[PDB]
Amino acid sequence: LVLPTYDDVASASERIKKFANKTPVLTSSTVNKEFVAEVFFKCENFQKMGAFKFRGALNALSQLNEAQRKAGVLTFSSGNHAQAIALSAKILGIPAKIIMPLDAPEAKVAATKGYGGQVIMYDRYKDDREKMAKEISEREGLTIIPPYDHPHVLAGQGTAAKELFEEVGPLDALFVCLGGGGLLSGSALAARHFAPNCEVYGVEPEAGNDGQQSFRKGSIVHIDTPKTIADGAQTQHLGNYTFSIIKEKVDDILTVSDEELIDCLKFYAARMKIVVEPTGCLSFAAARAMKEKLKNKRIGIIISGGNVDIERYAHFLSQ
Amino acid sequence: LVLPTYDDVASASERIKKFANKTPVLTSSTVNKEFVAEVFFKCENFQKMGAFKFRGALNALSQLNEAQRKAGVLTFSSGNHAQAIALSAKILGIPAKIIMPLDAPEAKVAATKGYGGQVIMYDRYKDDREKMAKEISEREGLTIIPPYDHPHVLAGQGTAAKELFEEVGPLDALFVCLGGGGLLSGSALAARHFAPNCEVYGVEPEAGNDGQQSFRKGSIVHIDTPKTIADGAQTQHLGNYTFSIIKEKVDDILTVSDEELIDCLKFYAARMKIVVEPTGCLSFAAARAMKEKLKNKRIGIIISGGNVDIERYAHFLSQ
Ligand SMILES: *C[C@@H](NCc1c(COP(=O)(O)O)cnc(C)c1O)C(=O)O
Ligand SMILES: *C[C@@H](NCc1c(COP(=O)(O)O)cnc(C)c1O)C(=O)O
Numbered sequence: 239l240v241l242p243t244y245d246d247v248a249s250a251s252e253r254i255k256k257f258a259n260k261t262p263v264l265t266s267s268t269v270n271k272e273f274v275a276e277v278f279f280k281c282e283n284f285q286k287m288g289a290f291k292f293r294g295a296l297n298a299l300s301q302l303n304e305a306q307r308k309a310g311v312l313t314f315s316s317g318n319h320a321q322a323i324a325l326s327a328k329i330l331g332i333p334a335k336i337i338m339p340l341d342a343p344e345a346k347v348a349a350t351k352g353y354g355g356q357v358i359m360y361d362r363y364k365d366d367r368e369k370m371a372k373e374i375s376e377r378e379g380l381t382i383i384p385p386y387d388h389p390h391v392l393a394g395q396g397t398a399a400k401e402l403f404e405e406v407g408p409l410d411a412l413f414v415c416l417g418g419g420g421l422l423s424g425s426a427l428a429a430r431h432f433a434p435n436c437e438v439y440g441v442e443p444e445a446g447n448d449g450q451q452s453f454r455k456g457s458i459v460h461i462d463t464p465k466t467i468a469d470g471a472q473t474q475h476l477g478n479y480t481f482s483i484i485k486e487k488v489d490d491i492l493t494v495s496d497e498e499l500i501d502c503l504k505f506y507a508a509r510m511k512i513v514v515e516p517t518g519c520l521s522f523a524a525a526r527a528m529k530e531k532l533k534n535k536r537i538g539i540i541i542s543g544g545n546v547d548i549e550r551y552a553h554f555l556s557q
Numbered sequence: 558l559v560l561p562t563y564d565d566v567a568s569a570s571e572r573i574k575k576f577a578n579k580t581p582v583l584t585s586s587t588v589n590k591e592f593v594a595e596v597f598f599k600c601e602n603f604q605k606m607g608a609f610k611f612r613g614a615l616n617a618l619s620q621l622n623e624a625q626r627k628a629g630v631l632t633f634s635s636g637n638h639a640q641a642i643a644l645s646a647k648i649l650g651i652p653a654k655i656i657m658p659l660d661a662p663e664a665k666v667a668a669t670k671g672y673g674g675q676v677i678m679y680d681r682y683k684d685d686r687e688k689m690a691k692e693i694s695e696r697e698g699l700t701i702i703p704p705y706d707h708p709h710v711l712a713g714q715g716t717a718a719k720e721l722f723e724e725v726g727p728l729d730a731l732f733v734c735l736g737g738g739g740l741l742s743g744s745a746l747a748a749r750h751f752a753p754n755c756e757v758y759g760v761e762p763e764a765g766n767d768g769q770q771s772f773r774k775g776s777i778v779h780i781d782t783p784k785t786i787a788d789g790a791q792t793q794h795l796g797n798y799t800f801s802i803i804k805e806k807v808d809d810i811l812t813v814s815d816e817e818l819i820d821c822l823k824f825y826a827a828r829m830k831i832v833v834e835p836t837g838c839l840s841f842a843a844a845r846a847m848k849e850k851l852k853n854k855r856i857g858i859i860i861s862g863g864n865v866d867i868e869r870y871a872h873f874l875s876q
């Protein structure tokens with residue numbers, strides 16, 4: 239596999255500049271005092287469509303030629319890449335078919351349809367969504383734009399970390415949410431450019447620690463779909479492109495419980511005044527767990543997204 | 558009364574630069590499409606202590622001399638000015654006594670105490686908090702720093718609008734939440750400097766439309782404490798300094814129902830991913846109600862604060 243490099247992240251910044259949001263970086267006095275450090279939060283929950291995914295989607299679709307754009311694209315996603323592709327596709331006038339899990343947050347499915355995406359569903363725990371994707375794409379002549387295991391997609395996700403480092407400088411540690419590895423691999427490429435000798439940490443829900451196992455083992459570990467409220471991290475295994483990069487440019491993979499995610503979600507709401515979906519709480523939850531190692535350092539936290547069903551969010555806040 | 562001018566808002570920017578947050582401005586594609594306009598949201602819910610109040614508090618306390626700082630300050634507040642004064646006072650080593658309503662959000666009372674403020678309570682609907690303030694201050698030799706009816710306080714609140722105009726330019730209309738009039742009067746001073754011929758609108762909860770009545774009548778109208786979820790706008794009447802300015806530099810005062818505030822709060826959470834307290838939803842709620850007048854214009858919305866009890870917020874999101 240020909241792996242993308244920081245050069246691809248840099249070019250991605252150019253391709254998305256026209257429509258993507260240069261999301262703000264927030265800080266918290268409470269957090270800094272508790273951690274005895276300087277923590278910076280990159281708010282991708284404020285990105286177009288509510289998650290970092292718009293970056294990878296636009297970067298990928300922008301590189302399709304005229305014929306490919308007219309023919310249409312297909313993708314499979316837990317929900318955010320789905321919305322990202324739908325929005326990017328609308329902007330570029332590209333027809334888009336999207337395969338989503340039946341138990342995906344209603345808000346993510348609704349938004350995808352609202353953007354003009356044609357949605358087909360699958361069972362997250364029993365079906366092989368990639369098998370479905372291949373067949374539908376092969377049968378309808380559609381270009382598949384994977385949710386993470388693709389050079390253009392992962393390179394694009396890396397622009398969030400790129401922007402963070404350009405705004406606050408190199409950081410001793412960067413915490414990143416981990417599902418298939420697109421956000422983490424892209425972030426790692428940017429991290430090694432701006433802070434080659436610092437730390438990059440991926441974080442998965444404990445029930446879905448396939449990435450952590452792969453990292454320790456040296457090969458991709460496959461697990462049954464994990465049951466966790468982190469709906470954007472229920473992947474069965476890491477992508478091939480992403481793992482290739484993660485294995486080389488990531489220092490460690492951590493895990494946190496759903497209980498910890500909920501406490502983090504409440505903290506974000508009560509102390510930082512921002513809405514973050516469970517999956518977007520992985521990074522901060524892990525940072526809190528290892529705060530002792532972060533004393534007197536500068537830390538970067540990626541808030542990956544904020545797309546949740548309000549009713550469910552209200553439920554979490556009530557725990 | 559010697560009314561403050563934009564010059565005082567400009568100087569206030571200098572006095573708070575050391576500790577205040579230059580809060581971000583957010584935009585929403587959904588909002589722009591619905592309004593057929595460009596709307597800009599000044600996020601004071603991201604200000605130090607979660608509300609715009611830190612601005613006026615720091616501006617006022619920073620202008621107290623050595624003897625006044627050592628002697629201590631006293632204030633009365635629904636909760637946000639309380640926290641703002643407590644925090645500012647801690648920064649400057651000033652002892653602070655704060656009178657708060659017994660039914661104020663627990664989070665606002667807790668934060669005030671956490672900042673070192675000595676809290677005394679009053680009944681929001683039956684007591685005369687200013688009578689209490691005068692006596693305690695006269696008896697203990699404390700300098701009173703009112704929550705809105707003071708030149709330094711209102712001038713400081715105006716720095717939020719100042720920053721908004723400096724970032725996005727003059728705006729056709731600016732919507733501002735209205736309680737005692739500090740935020741509105743300060744905002745109006747900044748507005749008339751950057752956009753002298755544009756529109757400035759104040760917004761009160763319908764049950765507490767004393768400000769609207771005063772604006773129409775030409776004199777201060779007094780009402781019994783209104784029952785509304787907008788806990789930072791339950792004032793019985795406008796301040797004297799604030800009304801003097803509002804009467805001259807504000808175009809109209811609008812009102813919205815609690816039902817409209819709740820719908821706005823849910824919108825902020827679901828579509829913009831931010832936590833906003835009921836009172837901070839007044840401005841946007843009113844803008845939505847008069848969207849027809851906003852077509853093809855540029856609008857400014859002040860998100861005044863985000864301090865709410867999580868349990869209560871979750872309750873609102875569930876409506
Ligand atoms: C791609 C997938 N979304 C994932 C997601 C992550 C994890 O990203 P990676 O899968 O490793 O690239 C972290 N936070 C959030 C909020 C989301 O959605 C999809 O939507 O298809
Ligand atoms: C001063 C008072 N807080 C009020 C408040 C307003 C209204 O401000 P004005 O009273 O007119 O200056 C709007 N939004 C929020 C969130 C708050 O708190 C206090 O806290 O004492």
Ligand SMILES: [Mg+2]
Binds near residue numbers: 442446472
């Ligand atoms: Mg996993």
Ligand SMILES: [Mg+2]
Binds near residue numbers: 735761768790791
């Ligand atoms: Mg009123």
